[PDB]
Design an enzyme around this catalytic site. Sequence first.
Site, PDB file in Angstrom:
ATOM      1  N   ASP A   3       0.585  -1.220  -0.139  1.00  0.00           N
ATOM      2  CA  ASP A   3       0.280  -0.042  -0.165  1.00  0.00           C
ATOM      3  C   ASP A   3       0.748   1.276  -0.184  1.00  0.00           C
ATOM      4  O   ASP A   3       1.731   2.060   1.075  1.00  0.00           O
ATOM      5  CB  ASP A   3      -1.154  -0.077   0.970  1.00  0.00           C
ATOM      6  N   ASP A  40      -2.993   5.478  -5.227  1.00  0.00           N
ATOM      7  CA  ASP A  40      -2.448   4.350  -4.245  1.00  0.00           C
ATOM      8  C   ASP A  40      -2.752   2.831  -4.334  1.00  0.00           C
ATOM      9  O   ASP A  40      -4.118   2.489  -4.806  1.00  0.00           O
ATOM     10  CB  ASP A  40      -4.510   4.728  -3.664  1.00  0.00           C
TER      11      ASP A  40
HETATM   12  C1  LIG Z   1      -2.631   5.126   8.735  1.00  0.00           C
HETATM   13  C2  LIG Z   1      -2.782   6.193   7.800  1.00  0.00           C
HETATM   14  C3  LIG Z   1      -1.457   6.244   6.483  1.00  0.00           C
HETATM   15  C4  LIG Z   1      -4.447   5.682   6.893  1.00  0.00           C
HETATM   16  C5  LIG Z   1      -4.422   6.850   5.604  1.00  0.00           C
HETATM   17  N1  LIG Z   1      -4.196   5.442   4.787  1.00  0.00           N
HETATM   18  C6  LIG Z   1      -4.889   4.379   4.382  1.00  0.00           C
HETATM   19  O1  LIG Z   1      -6.144   4.513   4.716  1.00  0.00           O
HETATM   20  C7  LIG Z   1      -5.140   3.361   2.948  1.00  0.00           C
HETATM   21  C8  LIG Z   1      -5.095   4.072   2.120  1.00  0.00           C
HETATM   22  N2  LIG Z   1      -4.047   2.877   1.548  1.00  0.00           N
HETATM   23  C9  LIG Z   1      -5.668   2.225   1.229  1.00  0.00           C
HETATM   24  C10 LIG Z   1      -5.760   1.316   2.137  1.00  0.00           C
HETATM   25  C11 LIG Z   1      -6.642   0.277   1.774  1.00  0.00           C
HETATM   26  N3  LIG Z   1      -6.461  -0.868   3.636  1.00  0.00           N
HETATM   27  C12 LIG Z   1      -7.977  -0.443   3.211  1.00  0.00           C
HETATM   28  C13 LIG Z   1      -8.838  -2.077   3.326  1.00  0.00           C
HETATM   29  O2  LIG Z   1     -10.304  -2.231   4.360  1.00  0.00           O
HETATM   30  N4  LIG Z   1      -8.254  -2.835   2.924  1.00  0.00           N
HETATM   31  C14 LIG Z   1      -9.241  -3.952   2.545  1.00  0.00           C
HETATM   32  C15 LIG Z   1      -8.999  -3.812   1.200  1.00  0.00           C
HETATM   33  C16 LIG Z   1     -10.156  -5.291   0.429  1.00  0.00           C
HETATM   34  C17 LIG Z   1     -10.862  -5.473   0.764  1.00  0.00           C
HETATM   35  C18 LIG Z   1     -10.676  -5.727   2.492  1.00  0.00           C
HETATM   36  C19 LIG Z   1      -9.483  -4.381   2.840  1.00  0.00           C
HETATM   37 CL1  LIG Z   1      -9.641  -5.290   5.113  1.00  0.00          CL
HETATM   38  C20 LIG Z   1      -6.524  -3.144   2.563  1.00  0.00           C
HETATM   39  C21 LIG Z   1      -6.355  -1.903   3.021  1.00  0.00           C
HETATM   40  C22 LIG Z   1      -5.305  -1.879   2.631  1.00  0.00           C
HETATM   41  C23 LIG Z   1      -6.522  -2.403   4.658  1.00  0.00           C
HETATM   42  C24 LIG Z   1      -5.641   2.595   3.943  1.00  0.00           C
END
Ligand SMILES: CC(C)CCNC(=O)[C@@H]1CNC[C@H](CN2CC(=O)N(c3ccccc3Cl)CC2(C)C)C1
EC number: 3.4.23.15
Length: 337
Positions: free
Chosen positions: A38, A223
Amino acid sequence: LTLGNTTSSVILTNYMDTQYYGEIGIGTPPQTFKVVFDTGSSNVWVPSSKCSRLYTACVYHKLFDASDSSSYKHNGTELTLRYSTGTVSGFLSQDIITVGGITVTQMFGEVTEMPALPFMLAEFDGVVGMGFIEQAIGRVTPIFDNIISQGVLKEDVFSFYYNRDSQSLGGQIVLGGSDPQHYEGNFHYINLIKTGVWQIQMKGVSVGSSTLLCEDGCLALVDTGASYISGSTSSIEKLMEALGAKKRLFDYVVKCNEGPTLPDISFHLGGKEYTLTSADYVFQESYSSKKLCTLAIHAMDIPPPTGPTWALGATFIRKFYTEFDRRNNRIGFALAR
Ligand SMILES: CC(C)CCNC(=O)[C@@H]1CNC[C@H](CN2CC(=O)N(c3ccccc3Cl)CC2(C)C)C1
Ligand SMILES: *[C@@H]1O[C@H](CO)[C@@H](O)[C@H](O)[C@H]1NC(C)=O
Protein backbone atom coordinates in the site's frame (compact mmCIF):
# COMPACT_ATOMS: atom_id res chain seq x y z
CA LEU A 1 22.33 6.98 -0.37
CA THR A 2 24.08 3.83 -1.74
CA LEU A 3 23.00 2.38 -5.10
CA GLY A 4 24.08 -1.24 -5.75
CA ASN A 5 23.24 -3.43 -8.71
CA THR A 6 20.29 -5.56 -7.54
CA THR A 7 16.63 -5.73 -8.53
CA SER A 8 13.83 -7.72 -6.99
CA SER A 9 10.38 -8.52 -8.15
CA VAL A 10 7.44 -9.70 -6.06
CA ILE A 11 4.85 -11.88 -7.84
CA LEU A 12 1.34 -10.70 -7.03
CA THR A 13 -1.87 -12.66 -6.97
CA ASN A 14 -5.05 -11.01 -8.25
CA TYR A 15 -8.29 -11.65 -6.39
CA MET A 16 -11.45 -10.37 -8.06
CA ASP A 17 -9.72 -7.31 -9.40
CA THR A 18 -9.88 -5.76 -5.92
CA GLN A 19 -7.02 -7.25 -3.90
CA TYR A 20 -3.45 -7.74 -5.06
CA TYR A 21 -1.06 -9.58 -2.79
CA GLY A 22 2.18 -11.47 -2.64
CA GLU A 23 4.31 -13.30 -0.13
CA ILE A 24 6.73 -12.20 2.57
CA GLY A 25 8.34 -14.35 5.25
CA ILE A 26 8.76 -13.31 8.90
CA GLY A 27 11.14 -14.80 11.51
CA THR A 28 13.45 -17.80 11.75
CA PRO A 29 12.38 -20.12 10.25
CA PRO A 30 10.16 -18.00 7.96
CA GLN A 31 6.43 -17.83 8.65
CA THR A 32 4.87 -16.78 5.31
CA PHE A 33 2.08 -14.21 4.98
CA LYS A 34 -0.02 -12.84 2.20
CA VAL A 35 0.24 -9.05 2.26
CA VAL A 36 -0.96 -6.11 0.17
CA PHE A 37 1.55 -3.39 -0.80
CA ASP A 38 0.00 0.00 0.00
CA THR A 39 1.59 3.23 -1.21
CA GLY A 40 -1.14 4.95 0.78
CA SER A 41 0.27 4.06 4.20
CA SER A 42 3.73 3.24 5.60
CA ASN A 43 3.39 0.52 8.25
CA VAL A 44 3.86 -3.22 8.19
CA TRP A 45 1.55 -5.58 10.02
CA VAL A 46 0.32 -9.10 10.09
CA PRO A 47 -2.17 -10.60 12.50
CA SER A 48 -0.66 -11.89 15.75
CA SER A 49 -1.01 -15.26 17.51
CA LYS A 50 -1.89 -13.18 20.54
CA CYS A 51 -5.10 -12.01 18.81
CA SER A 52 -8.12 -13.15 20.85
CA ARG A 53 -9.83 -15.92 18.93
CA LEU A 54 -13.05 -14.04 19.70
CA TYR A 55 -11.88 -11.99 16.69
CA THR A 56 -13.13 -14.21 13.91
CA ALA A 57 -10.90 -12.39 11.41
CA CYS A 58 -7.92 -13.88 13.23
CA VAL A 59 -9.32 -17.41 13.15
CA TYR A 60 -9.34 -16.95 9.34
CA HIS A 61 -5.83 -15.65 8.65
CA LYS A 62 -2.23 -16.66 9.17
CA LEU A 63 -1.00 -15.59 12.69
CA PHE A 64 2.63 -14.68 13.52
CA ASP A 65 3.91 -16.66 16.45
CA ALA A 66 6.88 -14.91 18.02
CA SER A 67 7.52 -17.98 20.18
CA ASP A 68 8.47 -19.93 17.07
CA SER A 69 10.96 -17.27 15.83
CA SER A 70 14.53 -17.45 16.92
CA SER A 71 15.20 -13.93 15.50
CA TYR A 72 12.29 -12.05 17.09
CA LYS A 73 13.14 -9.10 19.29
CA HIS A 74 10.56 -7.67 21.69
CA ASN A 75 9.38 -4.08 21.92
CA GLY A 76 5.67 -3.99 22.74
CA THR A 77 4.70 -0.37 22.41
CA GLU A 78 1.00 0.07 21.47
CA LEU A 79 -0.02 0.71 17.85
CA THR A 80 -3.22 1.65 16.01
CA LEU A 81 -3.66 1.96 12.30
CA ARG A 82 -6.81 3.81 11.40
CA TYR A 83 -7.31 3.46 7.69
CA SER A 84 -10.07 4.98 5.57
CA THR A 85 -12.30 1.94 5.80
CA GLY A 86 -11.31 0.15 9.01
CA THR A 87 -8.91 -0.14 11.92
CA VAL A 88 -6.34 -2.58 13.30
CA SER A 89 -4.56 -2.56 16.58
CA GLY A 90 -1.74 -4.31 18.43
CA PHE A 91 1.89 -3.77 19.33
CA LEU A 92 5.33 -3.31 17.68
CA SER A 93 7.76 -6.24 17.27
CA GLN A 94 11.02 -6.79 15.41
CA ASP A 95 12.22 -9.59 13.15
CA ILE A 96 13.69 -10.63 9.75
CA ILE A 97 11.42 -10.17 6.73
CA THR A 98 12.10 -11.65 3.33
CA VAL A 99 10.49 -9.82 0.45
CA GLY A 100 11.50 -10.54 -3.15
CA GLY A 101 14.56 -12.42 -1.86
CA ILE A 102 15.82 -9.33 0.01
CA THR A 103 16.20 -9.95 3.73
CA VAL A 104 15.64 -6.91 6.00
CA THR A 105 15.29 -6.43 9.77
CA GLN A 106 12.03 -4.64 10.37
CA MET A 107 9.76 -3.37 13.05
CA PHE A 108 6.14 -4.32 12.32
CA GLY A 109 2.82 -4.45 14.11
CA GLU A 110 1.50 -7.69 15.53
CA VAL A 111 -2.23 -6.93 15.27
CA THR A 112 -4.32 -8.23 18.20
CA GLU A 113 -7.55 -6.59 17.18
CA MET A 114 -8.85 -6.94 13.64
CA PRO A 115 -12.60 -6.39 13.02
CA ALA A 116 -14.66 -8.89 10.88
CA LEU A 117 -15.85 -6.05 8.76
CA PRO A 118 -13.80 -5.67 6.76
CA PHE A 119 -10.89 -8.05 7.45
CA MET A 120 -13.12 -11.04 7.12
CA LEU A 121 -13.51 -9.85 3.52
CA ALA A 122 -9.72 -9.86 2.94
CA GLU A 123 -7.89 -12.57 1.07
CA PHE A 124 -4.52 -11.35 2.49
CA ASP A 125 -3.36 -11.44 6.09
CA GLY A 126 -1.53 -8.14 6.39
CA VAL A 127 -0.17 -4.97 4.88
CA VAL A 128 3.22 -3.77 3.84
CA GLY A 129 3.09 0.04 3.55
CA MET A 130 5.16 1.54 0.74
CA GLY A 131 4.77 5.17 1.82
CA PHE A 132 7.17 7.65 3.43
CA ILE A 133 8.10 7.83 7.07
CA GLU A 134 6.03 11.05 7.27
CA GLN A 135 2.89 8.85 7.21
CA ALA A 136 4.15 6.05 9.47
CA ILE A 137 2.34 5.73 12.75
CA GLY A 138 4.56 5.27 15.83
CA ARG A 139 7.46 6.91 14.06
CA VAL A 140 8.55 3.32 12.94
CA THR A 141 10.91 3.18 9.86
CA PRO A 142 9.32 2.06 6.52
CA ILE A 143 10.51 -1.21 4.96
CA PHE A 144 11.62 0.42 1.73
CA ASP A 145 13.68 2.97 3.64
CA ASN A 146 15.29 0.07 5.41
CA ILE A 147 15.91 -1.81 2.12
CA ILE A 148 17.31 1.41 0.64
CA SER A 149 19.73 1.66 3.61
CA GLN A 150 21.26 -1.69 2.52
CA GLY A 151 22.52 -0.07 -0.74
CA VAL A 152 21.80 -2.93 -3.12
CA LEU A 153 19.11 -1.51 -5.42
CA LYS A 154 20.02 0.04 -8.79
CA GLU A 155 17.65 2.94 -8.41
CA ASP A 156 15.75 4.39 -5.45
CA VAL A 157 12.42 3.49 -7.12
CA PHE A 158 9.79 0.68 -7.20
CA SER A 159 7.09 -0.16 -9.79
CA PHE A 160 3.59 -1.72 -9.74
CA TYR A 161 1.93 -3.79 -12.39
CA TYR A 162 -1.63 -4.98 -11.73
CA ASN A 163 -2.99 -7.33 -14.36
CA ARG A 164 -6.65 -7.62 -15.05
CA ASP A 165 -7.65 -11.20 -15.31
CA SER A 166 -8.80 -13.07 -12.30
CA GLN A 167 -2.66 -19.38 -14.42
CA SER A 168 -1.37 -15.96 -15.53
CA LEU A 169 0.67 -13.36 -13.72
CA GLY A 170 -1.72 -11.66 -11.28
CA GLY A 171 0.46 -8.61 -10.67
CA GLN A 172 4.13 -7.68 -10.19
CA ILE A 173 6.17 -5.18 -8.16
CA VAL A 174 9.75 -4.29 -9.06
CA LEU A 175 11.84 -3.13 -6.12
CA GLY A 176 14.60 -0.85 -7.44
CA GLY A 177 13.42 -0.65 -11.03
CA SER A 178 10.70 -1.24 -13.53
CA ASP A 179 9.96 -4.22 -15.83
CA PRO A 180 9.79 -2.93 -19.40
CA GLN A 181 8.06 -6.23 -20.33
CA HIS A 182 4.90 -4.75 -18.71
CA TYR A 183 4.64 -1.21 -20.05
CA GLU A 184 4.92 0.47 -23.48
CA GLY A 185 5.29 4.00 -24.88
CA ASN A 186 7.39 6.33 -22.71
CA PHE A 187 6.94 7.11 -19.05
CA HIS A 188 5.54 10.52 -18.16
CA TYR A 189 6.16 11.98 -14.77
CA ILE A 190 4.63 14.27 -12.21
CA ASN A 191 6.37 15.63 -9.08
CA LEU A 192 4.69 14.93 -5.80
CA ILE A 193 2.90 18.04 -4.59
CA LYS A 194 5.07 17.48 -1.51
CA THR A 195 7.46 14.86 -0.18
CA GLY A 196 6.16 12.43 2.50
CA VAL A 197 3.06 11.39 0.54
CA TRP A 198 2.55 9.69 -2.83
CA GLN A 199 0.16 12.43 -4.00
CA ILE A 200 0.30 14.76 -7.00
CA GLN A 201 -1.52 17.79 -8.37
CA MET A 202 -4.42 16.94 -10.73
CA LYS A 203 -5.49 19.54 -13.27
CA GLY A 204 -8.96 18.28 -14.12
CA VAL A 205 -11.37 15.41 -14.47
CA SER A 206 -13.53 15.08 -17.58
CA VAL A 207 -16.55 12.85 -17.94
CA GLY A 208 -17.15 12.51 -21.70
CA SER A 209 -17.19 15.91 -23.44
CA SER A 210 -18.88 17.91 -20.62
CA THR A 211 -15.96 18.22 -18.11
CA LEU A 212 -17.78 18.19 -14.78
CA LEU A 213 -15.04 17.95 -12.33
CA CYS A 214 -12.57 20.16 -10.49
CA GLU A 215 -12.21 22.72 -13.37
CA ASP A 216 -10.00 24.59 -10.92
CA GLY A 217 -7.67 21.86 -9.61
CA CYS A 218 -7.33 19.15 -6.97
CA LEU A 219 -5.22 16.46 -5.37
CA ALA A 220 -4.78 12.89 -6.43
CA LEU A 221 -3.60 10.15 -4.13
CA VAL A 222 -1.80 7.48 -6.22
CA ASP A 223 -2.86 4.49 -4.13
CA THR A 224 -1.80 0.90 -4.73
CA GLY A 225 -3.70 -0.37 -1.69
CA ALA A 226 -7.04 0.90 -2.93
CA SER A 227 -9.34 -1.19 -5.11
CA TYR A 228 -11.12 1.74 -6.70
CA ILE A 229 -10.76 5.28 -7.92
CA SER A 230 -12.18 7.49 -5.15
CA GLY A 231 -13.17 11.15 -5.04
CA SER A 232 -14.93 13.51 -2.61
CA THR A 233 -18.60 12.71 -1.92
CA SER A 234 -19.35 15.97 -3.59
CA SER A 235 -17.16 15.40 -6.71
CA ILE A 236 -18.43 11.79 -7.08
CA GLU A 237 -22.13 12.68 -6.85
CA LYS A 238 -21.79 14.84 -9.94
CA LEU A 239 -19.58 12.28 -11.65
CA MET A 240 -22.07 9.54 -11.04
CA GLU A 241 -25.08 11.69 -11.99
CA ALA A 242 -23.63 12.05 -15.51
CA LEU A 243 -23.44 8.24 -15.88
CA GLY A 244 -27.04 7.67 -14.91
CA ALA A 245 -25.64 5.74 -11.97
CA LYS A 246 -27.72 4.64 -8.99
CA LYS A 247 -26.03 5.09 -5.57
CA ARG A 248 -26.49 2.24 -3.09
CA LEU A 249 -24.92 1.45 0.28
CA PHE A 250 -21.19 1.14 -0.48
CA ASP A 251 -21.08 1.44 -4.23
CA TYR A 252 -22.64 2.84 -7.41
CA VAL A 253 -24.36 0.67 -10.02
CA VAL A 254 -26.04 0.84 -13.40
CA LYS A 255 -28.28 -1.51 -15.34
CA CYS A 256 -25.80 -4.09 -16.68
CA ASN A 257 -26.83 -3.37 -20.26
CA GLU A 258 -26.00 0.31 -19.92
CA GLY A 259 -22.38 -0.40 -18.90
CA PRO A 260 -20.80 -0.28 -22.39
CA THR A 261 -22.80 2.88 -23.26
CA LEU A 262 -21.00 4.68 -20.42
CA PRO A 263 -18.70 7.48 -21.67
CA ASP A 264 -14.92 7.85 -21.20
CA ILE A 265 -13.42 9.23 -17.96
CA SER A 266 -10.16 11.14 -18.18
CA PHE A 267 -7.87 12.49 -15.51
CA HIS A 268 -5.46 15.27 -16.35
CA LEU A 269 -2.06 14.60 -14.83
CA GLY A 270 0.98 16.78 -15.72
CA GLY A 271 0.45 17.18 -19.44
CA LYS A 272 -0.99 13.81 -20.45
CA GLU A 273 -4.69 12.94 -20.48
CA TYR A 274 -5.26 9.53 -18.84
CA THR A 275 -8.49 8.07 -20.18
CA LEU A 276 -10.50 5.09 -18.99
CA THR A 277 -13.20 3.57 -21.18
CA SER A 278 -16.27 2.08 -19.48
CA ALA A 279 -14.75 -1.38 -19.89
CA ASP A 280 -11.96 0.00 -17.69
CA TYR A 281 -14.15 0.90 -14.75
CA VAL A 282 -17.29 -1.22 -14.97
CA PHE A 283 -17.63 -4.73 -13.57
CA GLN A 284 -19.36 -6.08 -16.65
CA GLU A 285 -20.47 -9.48 -15.36
CA SER A 286 -23.69 -9.46 -17.32
CA TYR A 287 -25.43 -7.62 -20.19
CA SER A 288 -28.96 -7.88 -18.82
CA SER A 289 -31.28 -4.98 -17.98
CA LYS A 290 -32.62 -6.99 -15.08
CA LYS A 291 -29.27 -6.88 -13.24
CA LEU A 292 -27.17 -4.22 -11.55
CA CYS A 293 -23.46 -3.96 -12.28
CA THR A 294 -21.04 -2.28 -9.91
CA LEU A 295 -18.59 0.56 -10.67
CA ALA A 296 -14.94 0.60 -9.68
CA ILE A 297 -15.23 4.24 -8.58
CA HIS A 298 -16.25 4.89 -4.96
CA ALA A 299 -17.14 8.07 -3.07
CA MET A 300 -14.72 8.64 -0.17
CA ASP A 301 -14.01 11.72 1.90
CA ILE A 302 -10.44 11.94 3.10
CA PRO A 303 -9.57 14.58 5.78
CA PRO A 304 -6.65 17.05 6.12
CA PRO A 305 -3.82 17.30 5.88
CA THR A 306 -4.21 14.69 3.11
CA GLY A 307 -7.72 15.58 1.94
CA PRO A 308 -9.92 16.44 0.32
CA THR A 309 -8.53 14.29 -2.54
CA TRP A 310 -9.12 11.87 -5.36
CA ALA A 311 -7.58 8.46 -5.03
CA LEU A 312 -6.20 6.57 -8.03
CA GLY A 313 -6.17 2.89 -7.10
CA ALA A 314 -6.23 -0.50 -8.81
CA THR A 315 -8.86 0.62 -11.34
CA PHE A 316 -6.34 3.12 -12.68
CA ILE A 317 -3.07 1.22 -12.09
CA ARG A 318 -4.46 -1.67 -14.15
CA LYS A 319 -4.19 0.51 -17.29
CA PHE A 320 -1.09 2.49 -16.49
CA TYR A 321 2.07 0.88 -15.18
CA THR A 322 3.27 3.02 -12.25
CA GLU A 323 6.75 3.80 -10.97
CA PHE A 324 7.28 5.52 -7.65
CA ASP A 325 10.43 7.68 -7.83
CA ARG A 326 11.75 8.27 -4.31
CA ARG A 327 14.98 9.87 -5.58
CA ASN A 328 13.25 12.65 -7.49
CA ASN A 329 9.87 12.62 -5.73
CA ARG A 330 7.84 11.97 -8.85
CA ILE A 331 5.49 9.35 -10.23
CA GLY A 332 5.79 7.97 -13.76
CA PHE A 333 2.85 6.55 -15.72
CA ALA A 334 3.20 4.33 -18.72
CA LEU A 335 0.71 2.30 -20.69
CA ALA A 336 0.53 -1.13 -19.07
CA ARG A 337 0.80 -3.99 -21.54
C1 LIG B 1 -2.64 5.06 8.62
C2 LIG B 1 -2.93 6.10 7.55
C3 LIG B 1 -1.83 6.17 6.50
C4 LIG B 1 -4.29 5.85 6.92
C5 LIG B 1 -4.38 6.40 5.53
N1 LIG B 1 -4.18 5.26 4.69
C6 LIG B 1 -5.25 4.47 4.37
O1 LIG B 1 -6.38 4.57 4.80
C7 LIG B 1 -4.86 3.43 3.40
C8 LIG B 1 -4.78 4.10 2.06
N2 LIG B 1 -4.39 3.11 1.07
C9 LIG B 1 -5.48 2.14 0.98
C10 LIG B 1 -5.60 1.39 2.30
C11 LIG B 1 -6.64 0.33 2.10
N3 LIG B 1 -6.90 -0.43 3.31
C12 LIG B 1 -8.33 -0.51 3.17
C13 LIG B 1 -8.86 -1.81 3.58
O2 LIG B 1 -9.74 -1.81 4.41
N4 LIG B 1 -8.27 -2.88 2.94
C14 LIG B 1 -9.06 -3.81 2.30
C15 LIG B 1 -9.23 -3.72 0.94
C16 LIG B 1 -10.02 -4.66 0.29
C17 LIG B 1 -10.63 -5.67 1.00
C18 LIG B 1 -10.47 -5.78 2.37
C19 LIG B 1 -9.68 -4.82 2.98
CL1 LIG B 1 -9.44 -4.89 4.66
C20 LIG B 1 -6.99 -2.69 2.34
C21 LIG B 1 -6.26 -1.75 3.23
C22 LIG B 1 -4.90 -1.68 2.59
C23 LIG B 1 -6.17 -2.24 4.66
C24 LIG B 1 -5.92 2.34 3.44
C1 LIG C 1 10.52 0.26 20.99
O1 LIG C 1 11.45 0.88 20.07
C2 LIG C 1 11.73 2.23 20.48
C3 LIG C 1 12.41 3.00 19.35
O2 LIG C 1 13.82 2.90 19.33
C4 LIG C 1 12.50 2.19 21.81
O3 LIG C 1 12.82 3.45 22.39
C5 LIG C 1 11.72 1.38 22.82
O4 LIG C 1 12.54 1.26 23.97
C6 LIG C 1 11.30 0.00 22.29
N1 LIG C 1 10.73 -0.60 23.50
C7 LIG C 1 11.25 -1.67 24.15
C8 LIG C 1 10.57 -2.02 25.45
O5 LIG C 1 12.19 -2.41 23.73
